[PDB]
Amino acid sequence: SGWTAGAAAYYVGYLQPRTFLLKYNENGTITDAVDCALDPLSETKCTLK
Amino acid sequence: SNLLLQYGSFCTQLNRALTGIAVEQDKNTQEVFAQVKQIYKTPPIKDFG
Numbered sequence: 148s149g150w151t152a153g154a155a156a157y158y159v160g161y162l163q164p165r166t167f168l169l170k171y172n173e174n175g176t177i178t179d180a181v182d183c184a185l186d187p188l189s190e191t192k193c194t195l196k
Numbered sequence: 197s198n199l200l201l202q203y204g205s206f207c208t209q210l211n212r213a214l215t216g217i218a219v220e221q222d223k224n225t226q227e228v229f230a231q232v233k234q235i236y237k238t239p240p241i242k243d244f245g
C-alpha cells in the first residue's frame with residue numbers, strides 16, 4: 148500500500164490491414180488521409196483518387 | 197488487390213470512360229425525346245376530320 152497514483156492517461160488501439168489515401172503538402176508533411184473502406188463517401192474518394 | 201493497387205490510374209481512367217458513356221446515353225435519350233417542355237394531353241373529342 149503506501150503510494151499514490153500518477154496523473155496520466157493512455158489509449159490503446161489495434162492496427163488492421165487497411166488501404167489509406169494520404170495527402171502530402173508542399174513542405175513534405177502528411178496533412179490529411181482518407182480511410183478507404185470506412186464509409187461509402189470514403190470509398191468514393193478512394194475509388195476516384 | 198494489394199498488387200492491383202499500383203494500377204489505380206488505369207482503373208480510374210477505365211471507370212471514367214464507362215461513366216462518360218453512361219451519362220451520354222441519358223443525354224441521347226433527353227435530346228431525342230425531351231424536346232417538348234410541356235406534356236400536352238390528347239383532347240377528349242377525336243373529331244380530326
Ligand SMILES: *[C@@H]1O[C@H](CO)[C@@H](O)[C@H](O)[C@H]1NC(C)=O
Nearest residue numbers: 171172173174175176177178
Ligand atoms: C512551408 O514552409 C515555409 C517556410 O518554412 C512556410 O512559409 C510555409 O508556411 C510552410 N507551409 C506549410 C503548409 O506548412
